[PDB]
Structures are given as C-alpha cells and as structure tokens.
C-alpha cells in the first residue's frame, strides 16, 4: 500500500521465463461495494431464514 491504493504483484514463470504483473487497485466506490457485498448478504440471510 502506498497512498489509498493497493499494489498486488504477481510473479510467475511461463516456459521458464519471468512474467510480472501488477494490479494497481484503488478504493472502490460506494455503489460497487454495496452491489457486491451488502445486498447479496441480506439476500442470503433472508433465504436462510426462510
């Protein structure tokens, strides 16, 4: 983490050669967080209650 950011480094070997990739993820917007975690969780809770 550098500044409100997440650097995720993946290093691999393909055919015996280096292969580097970096995800420069940034804090998600309120809409995405809600749509991906909040409403589905309440859905599962209600289904389990039923």
């Amino acid at each position: 983490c550098v500044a409100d950011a997440l650097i995720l480094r993946v290093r691999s070997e393909l055919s015996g050669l280096p292969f580097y990739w970096n995800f420069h993820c940034m804090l998600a917007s309120p809409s995405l967080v809600s749509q991906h975690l909040i409403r589905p969780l309440m859905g599962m809770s209600l289904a389990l209650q039923c």
């Binding site: 995720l8 995800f23 998600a28 967080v33 975690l37």
Partner: protein, 50 residues
Amino acid sequence: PVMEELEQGLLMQPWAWLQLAENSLLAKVFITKQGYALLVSDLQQVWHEQ
C-alpha cells in the same frame, strides 16, 4: 462495448480466497480478451480495478 460485459462477469463470479506472503484476502477476478476486472477485500476495505 466490453465494459458492461466485464462488469456483469465480475458480478456473477464467486468469491475466492487468496493467501499472500503474510496475509490473506478475498478476491473476484473476471478476465476477457478485451481486458479484466478485479475486486479484492480484507473485510475492512474494498479495492477494485477495471
């Protein structure tokens, strides 16, 4: 375009567990030939990158 397809694929995908060098997080990746979308979390913060 492909942004809508990437968003739909990311939404439909299930969560996964990633064990890094020292910590662990929850991850959600959808990669298509035209790009990718990633959503990671550690139960305290959420990051996203398309």
